[PDB]
Design a protein around this ligand. Structure first.
Ligand SMILES: [Zn+2]
Lengths: 49, 50, 49, 288, 49, 69, 72, 497
DNA sequence: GCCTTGACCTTCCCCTTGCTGGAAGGTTTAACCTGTGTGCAGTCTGACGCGGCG
């Protein structure tokens, strides 16, 4: 439960939904990133990606 | 300090043995209330407005 | 306006007394740096004029 | 207040003692109900100063009338609490240790000085190899390194009449042995024979370093530590927020463990226990 | 990056050489890595993790 | 080069400000060094007047005071 | 002796016993090197008297007089 | 051949710095020793300390003997505490009575009284008196050594040599450094007499051009010999036997020293096993391990071996106590003493079960009444339990902010308030100067204005003069002239103050 | 406005019984049990230094 709750609530992925407009909601749901674990970092990146 | 000490020597009235921590509206902000809520422990007395 | 203490207080009470005057000091953070390096075995100090 | 210039140098043990007000002895910070300092801890008001403007620990002395008075009940001096910032403390140690900068940076400045490699010195300090202070005989040489088994070989060859050791204090007495002066003149004239590339460069570097030690008044054995300073508290605080939880500068941790190991060592030293445990505790201290 | 096994090659980091340097990598979901590669001087080499 | 022309300076406090502080403090410490506040940067740290602009007029005076006791 | 054994024999507790002791109303039992109140039989029966005297109603002082007679 | 492994690996250690590898590589050298190492090492320790208790016989020097300490223990009319349980106590080859002790302490006092006057008999080590001494000893040898107080008795001999030895050094401190002196000659005749000034001219018989210049410090060289002499006066023997006694107990204790080492090295892997069971992430490895090592030391320090059991388990639980204590004393910025700790541990063990069974976290009342104690203590324990929170924690999701930025010094000052106080003070003494000098001044000392201190009815009065009640009425009329709705208005603002 | 003059209030501290409760702090148990690690960290990267190795 510890690992699960800290994941759902302290990672860099669990973001507060944006209730500006429904568009904000659904496009924030239909996101893709490439950051975080098993992932990238801006200093480790260039331009080809 | 001796100065306000002297002042209360003139007038006499004091503070009690309790102080204020009252909440207030922040500076510059204004508006209208439409709701309140209370969350209270189990076993503790729910007061009048509670 | 940042660090000196005597100066900020004194000038507040000067300009409220219709005086546009200055009385600086020497900031705190410099002395903080001094203490921090004296933590390390350093005999830093200050030479008189 | 006003002045002209700045000066920099290493700090001798006498001076760091002078700077301090009272030694520290144990890692206690505060009581879990009476959030107040203990004695000879890290926040002891006796060393650092009062908690507030002209208030002692218990409250014996206040209101400016007992100006330079110390509260003999606890032993706390009465002044502002503005000296949370100023009064730094100190510590005595059991065995000395090395300042990491003055060996482990690029150029070591000390193995450099002695022409000695780096790994030899590490293998000394982590207690993997003895080394000669001084070869009392014409057999052996200074700076000569020994494994423990071959140390024993030479031991049962001689036993008494040499000087070798494993640890840091070895290096203390070692560099306390040498002299700047005649070695400087040596390398001065030694330059003249072959002023070829590496000869010239290294001789240059060393002679300059030596001369810098010479005229500066500094001394090399001051580059290691029988003493430490203790930074004042409010630069390393321990403070609540409104919810009641105390925040803590992680530095506090770095200090507190140190103390305990030191005095833990003084337990074992008061038993003359096997040197193995002693060795690994020294290692731990250096690492800390 | 998906798991599996990837190939690639660099454009002579020994630009002295100015020559291609092939290498190859495996990637599990979980565990340890490997890396095969050529040196400039025509020899295979290997490194874990 | 630029960076090491900055580092290799007759003072160090500007030098000890932007690159590889550790080495700088180490080399300065052994020799018994001392700065005499001729640059700008150092006079900024302390908070004194810079020896320039409006303030040259005063720092020159303090220089002849170094001459005049 | 050990102390709890004696106090569970006589019903008292170490706290009440030490009150009585501080009142100087019985023999002072010695300690040990560790600090355990070294009781005896004399201390046992003196304690029994000092107990039953206030039960009878002879007060602290008067029960102490009964005790110093028990020594006499 | 484990040091040979150190040789090669060190010859190509990959610049390792971790002491963990170092310590484990070192302790792995000396291998275990089982099922007879225990017993034969115990019997070596037996040999050592019983060579000591043999040495413990025959002290004309340490005349203060267990006879004397037996006068001590019964000096205050009684003792049954453990001082006697360390005393004579014959083991089969338990508070002692007075009868049993007086019986056991009679024959050794008999040997005392008969054994001394015979030492005079034509030699201190005369065969008849010396075999009487041997009876005293051998009679004491079936009996056991006696407790820590006997260390004083050994130290009471150390303090002899601590002086005696030192005095020779002290004499040497006046003798051997300043002028030339031989050393193939000095020791031999220093052993020769050692009692009177006889070897002096015997050594100067070489005619020694350095020796004749024995002046200007010699009234300290011979007065340093005189310290040795007045010690010969103090003791009463020219030692050659009790020095041998020092050798005897020296090797006898050294026996044990060397002995229980290899008991230490025997059982270190036990320590790391225990520790890494306890390495649940409270503190750190090595300090725990070192604590296990002191653990093992005191385990061996008092090991009965005739219980038949294996050393391991006895030692093991003593180790457990050491580390579970030290983890409690340390591992927090906040010292929480032990009983609160164990309460917490108990409590959490309980609540685990409670949330098995209820499918939920428990309520304080519930597990409290199961824990048989009222809610207040539980609640306070919970208020107290959690750790601090690391000032430099990043409240900023990225490295944009640390927590140490967003707090304030809610202690120091405020400038407007300083000006407030200053203007108030100006107004106050402005008002004072409008009133009479004596009255205003008397009020300054009454209330401490413009001075360090404060004074009261009788102090201020009898500084001025005796008056008490009319003084009160004087400050009252001072208020009356001061109430006065012309002067308040410079201070009416400070009614809000 | 100087002296009291006696009589009155209020507060703080200390003191008597017969213990009780609680905190803070100490020292010993015999079936036994012997070599981490433990999840990192994904390899940025170009100049400039420097150490061994030719
Ligand atoms: Zn106080």
């Amino acid at each position: 439960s510890a690992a699960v709750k800290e994941f759902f609530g302290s990672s860099q992925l669990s973001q507060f939904m944006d209730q500006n407009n429904p568009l904000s909601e659904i496009t924030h749901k239909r996101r893709i990133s490439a950051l975080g674990p098993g992932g990238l970092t801006r200093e480790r990146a260039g331009f080809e990606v | 300090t001796p100065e306000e000490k002297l002042l209360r020597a003139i007038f006499g009235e004091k503070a009690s043995d309790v102080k204020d921590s009252s909440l207030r509206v922040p500076n510059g902000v204004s508006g209208t209330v439409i709701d309140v809520q209370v969350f209270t422990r189990d076993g503790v007395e729910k007061d009048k407005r509670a | 306006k940042s660090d000196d203490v005597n100066g900020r207080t004194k000038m507040y009470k000067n300009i409220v007394d219709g005086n546009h005057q200055m009385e600086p000091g020497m900031p705190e953070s410099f002395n903080v740096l001094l203490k921090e390096i004296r933590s390390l075995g350093i005999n830093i100090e200050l030479e008189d004029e | 207040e006003e002045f002209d210039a700045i000066k920099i140098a290493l700090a001798s043990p006498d001076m760091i003692r002078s700077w301090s007000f009272g030694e520290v002895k144990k890692p206690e910070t505060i009581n879990y109900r009476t959030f107040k300092p203990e004695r000879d801890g890290l926040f002891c008001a006796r060393i650092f100063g009062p908690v507030k403007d002209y208030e002692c620990l218990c409250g014996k002395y206040k209101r400016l009338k007992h100006r330079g008075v110390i509260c003999e009940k606890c032993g706390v001096e009465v002044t502002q609490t503005k000296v949370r910032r100023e009064r730094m403390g100190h510590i005595e140690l059991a065995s000395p240790t090395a300042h990491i900068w003055f060996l482990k940076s690029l150029p070591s400045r000390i193995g450099l000085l002695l022409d000695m490699p780096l790994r030899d010195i590490e293998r000394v300090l982590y207690f993997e190899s003895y080394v000669v202070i001084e070869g009392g005989m014409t057999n052996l040489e200074r700076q000569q390194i020994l494994t423990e088994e071959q140390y024993l070989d030479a031991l049962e060859e001689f036993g008494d009449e040499f000087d070798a050791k494993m640890g840091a204090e070895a290096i203390q007495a070692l560099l306390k042995s040498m002299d700047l002066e005649q070695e400087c003149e040596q390398l001065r004239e030694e330059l003249n024979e072959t002023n070829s590339e590496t000869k010239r460069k290294k001789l240059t570097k060393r002679i300059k370093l030596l001369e810098a030690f010479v005229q500066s008044g500094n001394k090399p054995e001051w580059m290691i530590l029988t003493v430490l300073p203790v930074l004042p508290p409010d630069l390393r605080p321990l403070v609540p927020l409104d919810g009641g939880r105390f925040a803590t500068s992680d530095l506090n941790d770095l200090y507190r463990r140190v103390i305990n190991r030191n005095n833990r060592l003084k337990r074992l030293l008061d038993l003359a226990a096997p040197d193995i445990i002693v060795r690994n505790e020294k290692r731990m201290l250096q690492e800390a | 990056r998906s798991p599996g096994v990837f190939f690639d090659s660099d454009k002579g980091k020994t630009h002295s050489s100015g020559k291609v340097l092939y290498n190859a990598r495996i990637i599990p979901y979980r565990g340890s890595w490997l890396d095969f590669e050529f040196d400039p001087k025509d020899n295979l080499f290997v490194r874990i993790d | 080069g630029i960076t090491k022309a900055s580092l290799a300076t007759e003072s160090f406090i500007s030098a000890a400000s932007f690159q590889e502080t550790t080495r700088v403090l180490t080399e300065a410490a052994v020799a018994g060094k001392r700065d005499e506040l001729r640059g700008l940067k150092e006079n900024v740290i302390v908070g004194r007047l810079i020896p320039a602009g409006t303030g040259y007029a005063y720092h020159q005076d303090r220089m002849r005071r170094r001459a005049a006791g | 002796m050990n102390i709890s054994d004696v106090a569970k024999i006589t019903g008292l507790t170490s706290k009440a016993i030490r009150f009585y002791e501080e009142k100087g109303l019985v023999t002072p039992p010695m300690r040990s090197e560790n600090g355990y109140r070294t009781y005896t039989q004399q201390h046992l029966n003196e304690l029994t008297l000092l107990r039953q005297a206030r039960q009878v109603g002879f007060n602290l002082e008067e029960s102490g007089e009964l005790v110093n007679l028990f020594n006499d | 051949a484990a040091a040979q492994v150190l040789s090669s690996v060190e010859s190509e250690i990959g610049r390792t710095t971790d002491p963990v590898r170092m310590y484990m590589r070192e302790m792995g050298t000396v291998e275990l020793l089982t099922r007879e190492g225990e017993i034969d090492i115990a019997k070596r320790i037996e040999d050592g300390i019983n060579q000591v208790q043999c040495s413990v016989a025959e002290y004309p020097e340490a005349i203060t003997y267990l006879l004397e300490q037996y006068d001590r223990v019964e000096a205050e009319e009684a003792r049954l505490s453990d001082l006697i349980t360390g005393f004579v106590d014959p083991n089969a080859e338990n508070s002692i009575d007075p009868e049993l002790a007086r019986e056991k302490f009679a024959e050794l006092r008999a040997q005392y009284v008969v054994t001394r006057d015979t030492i005079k008999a034509k030699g201190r080590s005369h065969a008849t008196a010396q075999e009487e001494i041997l009876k005293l000893s051998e009679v004491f040898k079936q009996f056991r050594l006696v407790p820590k107080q006997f260390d004083y008795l050994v130290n009471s001999m150390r303090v002899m040599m601590d002086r005696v030895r030192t005095q020779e050094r002290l004499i040497m401190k006046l003798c051997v450094e300043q002028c030339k002196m031989p050393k193939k000659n000095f020791i031999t005749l220093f052993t020769g007499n050692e009692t009177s000034d006889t070897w002096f001219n015997a050594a100067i018989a070489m005619n020694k051009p350095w020796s004749e210049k024995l002046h200007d410090v010699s009234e300290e060289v011979h007065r340093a010999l005189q310290k040795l002499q007045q010690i010969e006066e103090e003791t009463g023997l020219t030692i050659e036997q009790v020095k041998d006694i020092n050798r005897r107990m020296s090797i006898g204790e050294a026996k044990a020293r060397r002995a229980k080492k290899e008991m230490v090295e025997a059982n270190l892997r036990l320590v790391i096993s225990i520790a890494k069971k306890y390495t649940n992430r409270g503190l750190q490895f090595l300090d725990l391990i070192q604590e296990g090592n002191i653990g093992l030391m005191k385990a061996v320090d008092k090991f009965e071996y005739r219980r038949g059991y294996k050393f391991s388990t006895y030692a093991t639980w003593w180790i457990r106590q050491a580390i579970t204590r030290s983890i409690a004393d340390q591992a927090r910025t906040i010292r929480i003493p032990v009983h609160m700790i164990e309460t917490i541990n108990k409590l959490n063990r309980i609540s685990r079960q409670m949330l098995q069974e209820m499918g939920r976290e428990p309520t304080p009342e519930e597990l409290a009444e199961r824990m048989l104690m009222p809610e207040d203590k539980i609640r306070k324990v919970l208020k107290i339990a959690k750790e601090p929170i690391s000032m430099e924690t990043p409240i900023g999701d990225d490295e944009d902010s640390h927590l140490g930025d967003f707090i304030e010094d809610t202690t120091l000052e405020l400038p407007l308030d300083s000006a407030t106080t200053e203007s108030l003070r100006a107004a106050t003494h402005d008002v004072l100067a409008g009133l009479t000098a004596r009255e205003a001044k008397v009020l300054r000392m009454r209330f401490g204005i413009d001075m360090n201190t404060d004074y009261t009815l009788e102090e201020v009065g009898k500084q001025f003069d005796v008056t008490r009640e009319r003084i009160r009425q004087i400050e009252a009329k001072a208020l009356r002239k001061l109430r006065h709705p012309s002067r308040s208005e410079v201070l009416r603002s400070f009614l809000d103050d």
